[PDB]
Amino acid sequence: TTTVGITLKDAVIMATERRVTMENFIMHKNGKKLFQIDTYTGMTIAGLVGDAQVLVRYMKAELELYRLQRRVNMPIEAVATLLSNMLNQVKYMPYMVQLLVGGIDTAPHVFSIDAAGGSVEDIYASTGSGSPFVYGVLESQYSEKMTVDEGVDLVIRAISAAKQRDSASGGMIDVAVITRKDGYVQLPTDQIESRIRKLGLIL
Amino acid sequence: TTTVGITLKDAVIMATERRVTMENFIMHKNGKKLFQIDTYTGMTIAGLVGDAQVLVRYMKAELELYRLQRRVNMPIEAVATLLSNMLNQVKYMPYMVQLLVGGIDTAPHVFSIDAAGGSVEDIYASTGSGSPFVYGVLESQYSEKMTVDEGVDLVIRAISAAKQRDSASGGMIDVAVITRKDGYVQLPTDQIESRIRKLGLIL
Amino acid sequence: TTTVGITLKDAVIMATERRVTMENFIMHKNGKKLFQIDTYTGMTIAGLVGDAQVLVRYMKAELELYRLQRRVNMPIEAVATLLSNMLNQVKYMPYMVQLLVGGIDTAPHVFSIDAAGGSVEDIYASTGSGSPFVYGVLESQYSEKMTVDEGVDLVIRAISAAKQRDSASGGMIDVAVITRKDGYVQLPTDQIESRIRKLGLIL
Amino acid sequence: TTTVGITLKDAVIMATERRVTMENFIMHKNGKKLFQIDTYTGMTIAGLVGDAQVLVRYMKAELELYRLQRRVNMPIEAVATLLSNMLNQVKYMPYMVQLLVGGIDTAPHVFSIDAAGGSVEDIYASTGSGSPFVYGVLESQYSEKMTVDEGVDLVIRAISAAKQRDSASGGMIDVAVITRKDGYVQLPTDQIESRIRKLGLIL
Amino acid sequence: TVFSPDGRLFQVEYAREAVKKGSTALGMKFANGVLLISDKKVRSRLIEQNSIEKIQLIDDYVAAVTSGLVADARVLVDFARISAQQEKVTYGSLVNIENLVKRVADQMQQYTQYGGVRPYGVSLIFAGIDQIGPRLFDCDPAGTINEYKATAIGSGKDAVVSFLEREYKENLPEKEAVTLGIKALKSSLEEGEELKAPEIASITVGNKYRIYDQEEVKKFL
Amino acid sequence: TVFSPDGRLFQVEYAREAVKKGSTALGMKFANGVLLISDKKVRSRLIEQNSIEKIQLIDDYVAAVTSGLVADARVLVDFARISAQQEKVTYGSLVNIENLVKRVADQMQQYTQYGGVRPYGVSLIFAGIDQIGPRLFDCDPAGTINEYKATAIGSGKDAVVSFLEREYKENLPEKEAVTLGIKALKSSLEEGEELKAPEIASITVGNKYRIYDQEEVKKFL
Amino acid sequence: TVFSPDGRLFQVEYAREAVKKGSTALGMKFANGVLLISDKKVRSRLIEQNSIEKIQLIDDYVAAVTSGLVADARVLVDFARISAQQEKVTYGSLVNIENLVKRVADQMQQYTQYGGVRPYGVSLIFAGIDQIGPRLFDCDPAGTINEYKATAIGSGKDAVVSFLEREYKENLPEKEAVTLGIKALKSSLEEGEELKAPEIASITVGNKYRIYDQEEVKKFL
Amino acid sequence: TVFSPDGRLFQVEYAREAVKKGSTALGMKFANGVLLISDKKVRSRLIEQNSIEKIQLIDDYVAAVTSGLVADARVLVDFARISAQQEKVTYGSLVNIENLVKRVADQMQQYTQYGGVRPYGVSLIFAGIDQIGPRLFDCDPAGTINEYKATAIGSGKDAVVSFLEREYKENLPEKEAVTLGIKALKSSLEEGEELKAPEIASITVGNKYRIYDQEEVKKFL
Amino acid sequence: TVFSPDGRLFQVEYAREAVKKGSTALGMKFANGVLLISDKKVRSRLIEQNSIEKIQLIDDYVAAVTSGLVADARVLVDFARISAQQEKVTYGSLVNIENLVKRVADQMQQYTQYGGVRPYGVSLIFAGIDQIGPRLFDCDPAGTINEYKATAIGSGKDAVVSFLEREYKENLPEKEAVTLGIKALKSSLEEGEELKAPEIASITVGNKYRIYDQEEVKKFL
């Protein structure tokens, strides 16, 4: 599992693997770990699969019911605060996940949430087992003055650099770009694998 | 235990062993591990026997009550989502099973569900203890442009190739083919053992 | 403990030991482990004594109340399904038994039920600690074209062949033959020990 | 602790030690372990003292309330079945006892009940820590054609033969004879010690 | 359910007025047995006569007939069955029928004590053999139990209690006392009606119930 | 159950009106014992006279007679039996009968306090020996306990309390005081009726109850 | 819900008055099958006639029609579905339909016992095949169950019970008995109205239900 | 809530009298869509007209209009939203709108069964597309559900049901059927009043709701 | 709380009659703000005028005035404070005031649904700024919410709603609209009384509340 969130000027780029394993054994070469929980808000799950999917269904329900009752989308800090209260009211029968919540309310935000409900905002975050390789790329190549094109190419370089030194990460890569103008746009398969083929990488 | 699900163009082929053991000891040479839970939907159980049969009775009840209340069959992703919620509301007194749900709503689907409710869709899946041998056959011989005849012959080759390298798998083989035209059709005994005798295998 | 169930053409033969021990120590040389739970249905208990007797009292009550409320006897698959639900609703404070349910509804049935409620039908079954010796006799001598006389002589050969290689099995042997014509008929003591004396065995 | 029950033709003889210890240490040289729970029914306790006395108070209450509500004494198999249900509804916080219930309803009965509620009827039974020495005497000297005098002399020989090879058994011996004519008659001290002095034993 | 100024419970006597509209039913002790008879008034061709049940068994050794509101009757028959099976699980055998009747009549009493419930509008007869012998009981909507030798419930109660007051020699055989009981059930009617086939059940010590088929019923008729 | 403007509880006096329809029953202390007598009014040939029970035991040392609604009487006799066995389990022996009577009468009081329930329409007499001696008690539908030497309950109460007010020398033997009590029970009736066999039970310190069979009853009659 | 001074439950007969305003529905046994017919009174162009459901299935082998208050009818149909699936989970197969009808009618009885609830104003017909065979039942707002051969519920009940009392030869084939039933449903009406297309469902032993489409309905009409 | 002697529930018809004071609202099926219109009677300058909500969404594919007591309407709209999200959490998608309407109407039925609560004085219309298609429903204070093609609720109900009974060709496009519906809403009024801007919402299969702004509303007006 | 035969809830209109005895209070939107004014009728020298509170804060961005029974007003102000802090703990910030008003008015609705409670005799005004902007709400004892631009509650309601119906240009500055509101509060009175110092609170987007001291109040007076 390898999950990345990048905060640019007016965009959030969130990208993920697609591999589900069982301790050496690639059970599913094609998973789904990048979800759209609201119009301008995306969640990226990591950790245990079964708890993470149930958290996705709860957060889609609570965010949509919030949007109907109040006619405005939930602010991202309230999404991460809500999810921190949900994860922390249990804490001793816990959900074995770690989560990224990224979105746009007035400025772009990326919140990283652990299994006991500690939400911390940061300009870039990464969860999963191949997170330190992503942190290795993003320490030396991330600049907050990039465009969205260099952002997407950066996250493809980071996840493709974590696919080769982590055995629990692999498969096709899911990139989703969140702007105010179009919102949550998940990039198509052929565009991403054209970027992988164009940067000189292995899919 | 060895359970296979195969997604073809407009068919789902699900096949199973018929052997129930107790840690070296073949208690029953003739079990039943392939069930029809709905008109176009079949479930294949693996793991502990007693939990799996109770999950079969719950899913037959809930799917049939859904069909009576709504006059349409349940979509397969809602079957796997329902069963994921059932397995994951417990999670700490868990059901020690792993399950396959395969069916047809508009396109064929095969969902694989573990003991904590993580449902993942894949084009072919296999559970049980002789699952890696099935994965060995299905990596090298599965093509998604096969017909139903080559599909059934493939699953017989995979399970017959897992009966010989796994001691917890054996007995007669149960194949069930799910199409839109006829639905859930379980193939007869003499047709399957004619295919085993015709491919040059041991029953 | 050594318990046998045999499905013939139109008969079920169920036979048992009569010895209750405590880890080397023959506490009671004369127990009762073969019960008639319904008019055409017999149960044979194995495992812990105290849980098994309470299951016998529950099943006599539930089957008789079913018969009064519905004026027909319960089908055998519903007896084993009911008892599987009773054993499996606990599962973590479990009943440490293993049970045989044999009877006649339209065709003869023998269901074997373990301590977590996994009911499997088979043409012959055997529970207890001297079950593998019974399985040794019934692999080499059981033919489904036998009469009831050769069936009773077979089960006496199997249990008498498990009394000599198991120290937790012994005593007089209880045979009960279930047909549609007379029903549950437990064979008398002098007939069975005349068969033991006539086959050349030790009581 | 050493407790004996003997079923003769029309009598039940139940006899006991009178010593209460604490792991080497004779805390009380004079206990009471033989109780009359009903007009024709006696109970003999063994195991933990505190649980056994509470079971005695419950069984005196339930048997006497049964006798008032129904004007007939409870049958002995219903006493042992009732006490089996009482001991087995707990089973995991159990009473650490083992019990003998002996009495007369139409024929004499002796039921032996363990700590999980497994009641087994036998023609003679013995509980306690010096039970195997009693079983040694009663294998070689018990004949079911004895009178009550030879029965009482037998049980005095068995318990006096278990007082000398068990350190947790000793003291005066309590014999109680249950017949239909007089009922529960506990033999006096001077008669029993006259039998001990007359058979050539040590008190 | 409160007291009247002369010490009566009005809902209980109104419940007995609901009992007086039911079918006539008899219970009678044989020399070594008991007997239950019920007036099976067939009302149309369109009702399954083979599946209507008047004498319905609590147990193979205990049967019971009812009168009054048939829904409350079905509820108390189901409660009597469940209570009988609780006594078989707890003790091992149903030694006494009187305590089954007391466990029914303690609930029937319980609804005449508490406010928020109405009394049962049924009266029952419990017949069958046990460890004391062939026993016959009657239960009244206040929860009142009496042990009889021959009783009747329903609309034609007093004609049958009067007839069996004149009649009923004590230790009769089976067939003669069934003839006596069906003569009582003829004596309850008018001459504008005739008995269509009643429903008869009998038990003798050592055996289970023998619910009569229509050959023996029309033959005794 | 609320107060009347002159400070009375109407449901309790209506319950006492329900008590005044019951059977006449006596309790009487012997020199070293006590005694319970009950008027067994046989009403038909068809009722089992051998199984009807007026004096029914709470314990081998405690009996009780009842009057009023017989269903509430059966309920409070069962409650008295269960409470007696709770005191035997807790302490070891039934030392005092007065506290058994107080545990019955606290429930009978409890239903005259709360709304949603009606009072019990029964009055009871508790007789028997204990560690203080031969003791006799009476319990009233408000839950009112009095300890007597000779009392009566039922329809013919005042004739027997009047007769035993004139009569009843204190320390009598058994047979003479049974003769006195059955003369009281004759004095309660009319001349249009005669005593059919009453039911008599007696206890002496050191022994259990001796419920009289019909030879001693007809012999005393 | 309390008793009237002549022993009636007024809320139950008022509930039956609420039943007498419902639609007319028939149930009829075939030679080897059963049958349910319901009067589909189309009231406007603006209602979806294709989605209104009169015969609605409890199970593939058990259907039921209703009459009375349609909301209470929907509640009891949902309760019958959940109870049927509980019997399939517990035992494995739905052996007896009579106990499904008893589990519905025990709740319908239960609301005529307790205060704080009103009775259901519905009457139902349960039809379908099981291990005994083709079976037909009727349930009444007091919780009263009767097993029939041909019955009707609703406003036009007595015209159809009268017509099927004259008519209804017993072992008919499917098409002839559907013609008989739709002639009964014509006989219930007036001449100021004509039958718009009824709704018809049938089952034969071995098969599931076959709810008729409008070609067979207008063809039989 | 008890039965009247002719089988009616008085609190339910009084609740319908509370419904007949609400605002007029329409629902109408398009060729490939549905439609909700509500009469927005602006009462003063001092009320925020931009924030008053008549058509309020249960879901992006399910909307509902209300009539009656507006507080009970807000409560049942919140219950419909929570029930819709429970079906999305449990199953994954809202396949059927009819079962959302049944989960609302089972609660609305539930308060006409139990004592201690009064019925809801609201009537609702549920419109929206699902896996079967464009669907329209109406819910009545007894909990009565009907599936329509064009219906109306409120004070001016019968004028609009009469007008759409004459009018309403079935498969209309969007703009023509909005013109038809606003002509119905003009036909409900008097000539002493004129339509201030109604509130209109529409959905077509494949899309979410499009709540019309005042340009399209005044343009259609 | 049940329905009247013309569909009204009598306890709710009687609660509104309890509201019509309260103090007159105003709410008014500024160009970029809101405003609350309350009539502080000083009744004696002996009451602490410095500690009486009419405008009392739910939050630094949300205030509310009340009218009616002052005890129920204090209870609902405490409930509004606790609900506001629950929304701050759960989400992080109070985004919407409308849902605070809905959580108050769902309880105020809840007591007009259930029997055993009486409705609240209060009407409230909720004013304050949030993520949508300066917002003003009014809550009615049935739990009825309306969003206004300028409203009044209490005894002098209709004089102030009439005056602000004539007056109230929309986007006014602070001081001019406070002068307008205190002219409305003068217009509600008689000439036999004069305004003693009212209580005034105001908020502008970006700031917290500024409760006016008596210098600005007497200066505006």
Curated annotation (Swiss-Prot), chains A, B, C, D:
Database matches in PROSITE patterns: PROTEASOME_BETA_1 (PS00854), PROTEASOME_BETA_2 (PS51476)
Reactions performed catalytically: Cleavage of peptide bonds with very broad specificity
UniProt keyword Cytoplasm present: yes
Localization: Cytoplasm
Family: Belongs to the peptidase T1B family.
Function, in words: Component of the proteasome core, a large protease complex with broad specificity involved in protein degradation. The T.acidophilum proteasome is able to cleave oligopeptides after Tyr, Leu, Phe, and to a lesser extent after Glu and Arg. Thus, displays chymotrypsin-like activity and low level of caspase-like and trypsin-like activities.
Note: The configuration of the closed gate contains an opening large enough to allow rapid entry of tetrapeptides but able to impede the entry of proteins and longer peptides.
Name this polypeptide is given: Proteasome subunit beta
Naturally occurring in which organism (per UniProt): Thermoplasma acidophilum (strain ATCC 25905 / DSM 1728 / JCM 9062 / NBRC 15155 / AMRC-C165)
Taxonomy of the source species: Archaea, Methanobacteriati, Thermoplasmatota, Thermoplasmata, Thermoplasmatales
Gene that this polypeptide is encoded by: psmB
Swiss-Prot record, chains E, F, G, H, I:
Activity regulation info: The formation of the proteasomal ATPase PAN-20S proteasome complex, via the docking of the C-termini of PAN into the intersubunit pockets in the alpha-rings, triggers opening of the gate for substrate entry. Interconversion between the open-gate and close-gate conformations leads to a dynamic regulation of the 20S proteasome proteolysis activity.
Main localization category: cytoplasm
Name of the protein in its database record: Proteasome subunit alpha
Effect of L69 to A/E/G: Prevents PAN to stimulate gate opening
GO molecular function: endopeptidase activity; threonine-type endopeptidase activity
Family: Belongs to the peptidase T1A family.
Keywords (A to Z) from UniProt: Cytoplasm, Proteasome
GO cellular component, one term: proteasome core complex, alpha-subunit complex
Lineage: Archaea, Methanobacteriati, Thermoplasmatota, Thermoplasmata, Thermoplasmatales
PROSITE patterns reported in the protein's UniProt record: PROTEASOME_ALPHA_1, PROTEASOME_ALPHA_2
SMART domains: Proteasome_A_N
Free-text function comment from the UniProt entry: Component of the proteasome core, a large protease complex with broad specificity involved in protein degradation. The T.acidophilum proteasome is able to cleave oligopeptides after Tyr, Leu, Phe, and to a lesser extent after Glu and Arg. Thus, displays chymotrypsin-like activity and low level of caspase-like and trypsin-like activities.
Positions of transmembrane segments: none
Subunit details: The 20S proteasome core is composed of 14 alpha and 14 beta subunits that assemble into four stacked heptameric rings, resulting in a barrel-shaped structure. The two inner rings, each composed of seven catalytic beta subunits, are sandwiched by two outer rings, each composed of seven alpha subunits. The catalytic chamber with the active sites is on the inside of the barrel. Has a gated structure, the ends of the cylinder being occluded by the N-termini of the alpha-subunits. Is capped at one or both ends by the proteasome regulatory ATPase, PAN.
Organism the protein comes from: Thermoplasma acidophilum (strain ATCC 25905 / DSM 1728 / JCM 9062 / NBRC 15155 / AMRC-C165)
One GO term of the biological process aspect: proteasomal protein catabolic process
Cell location: Cytoplasm
Post-translational modification, as annotated: The N-terminus is blocked.
Note: The configuration of the closed gate contains an opening large enough to allow rapid entry of tetrapeptides but able to impede the entry of proteins and longer peptides.
Domain of life: Archaea
